[PDB]
Design a protein around this ligand. Structure first.
Ligand SMILES: CCOc1ccc(C(C)=O)cc1-c1cccc(-c2nn[nH]n2)c1
Ligand SMILES: CCOc1ccc(C(C)=O)cc1-c1cccc(-c2nn[nH]n2)c1
Length: 118
């Protein structure tokens, strides 16, 4: 049979937190992603029009710590949401877009063997 595995939040934290840590350890590349974008402080008033579902590393980390992910796919979705938001909002020539691309390469490398082990 093809059984759907049940995951406990503390098990997801142990398995998935290292993949998030790998993003945070990229410096300077993770710096734009460590806290929610504040459009007022960054002077980008159109941000929340373009980005309907903001996401950032601090939110993902707190969701892992506090057990808000029932399934690993939800964590993976939040990470790709964060990256796709940044590629959407920022220009291809921009520092943040290029940092995003680096983080996404790191994430793809880290998430695949972890998800295979899960
Ligand atoms: C909430 C802010 O989190 C961070 C901030 C900065 C940095 C840096 C400087 O690298 C790392 C984290 C972070 C994140 C998740 C896991 C871990 C971690 N878990 N076990 N070892 N490291 C470390
Ligand atoms: C100067 C333009 O900032 C941004 C533009 C877009 C976005 C996003 C994620 O779409 C993020 C930031 C941002 C936010 C906080 C810190 C930093 C930062 N701190 N050190 N280096 N970069 C960069």
């Amino acid at each position: 049979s093809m059984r759907k595995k049940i995951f406990k939040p503390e098990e997801l934290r142990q398995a998935l937190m290292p993949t998030l840590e790998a993003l945070y350890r990229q410096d300077p590349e993770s710096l734009p992603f460590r806290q929610p974008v504040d459009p007022q402080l960054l002077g980008i008033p159109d941000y929340f029009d373009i980005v309907k579902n903001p996401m950032d590393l601090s939110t993902i980390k707190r969701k892992l710590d506090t057990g808000q992910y029932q399934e690993p796919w939800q964590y993976v979705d939040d990470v790709w949401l964060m990256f796709n938001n940044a590629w959407l909002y920022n220009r291809k020539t921009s520092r943040v877009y290029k940092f995003c691309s680096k983080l996404a390469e790191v994430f793809e490398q880290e998430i695949d063997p972890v998800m295979q082990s899960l």
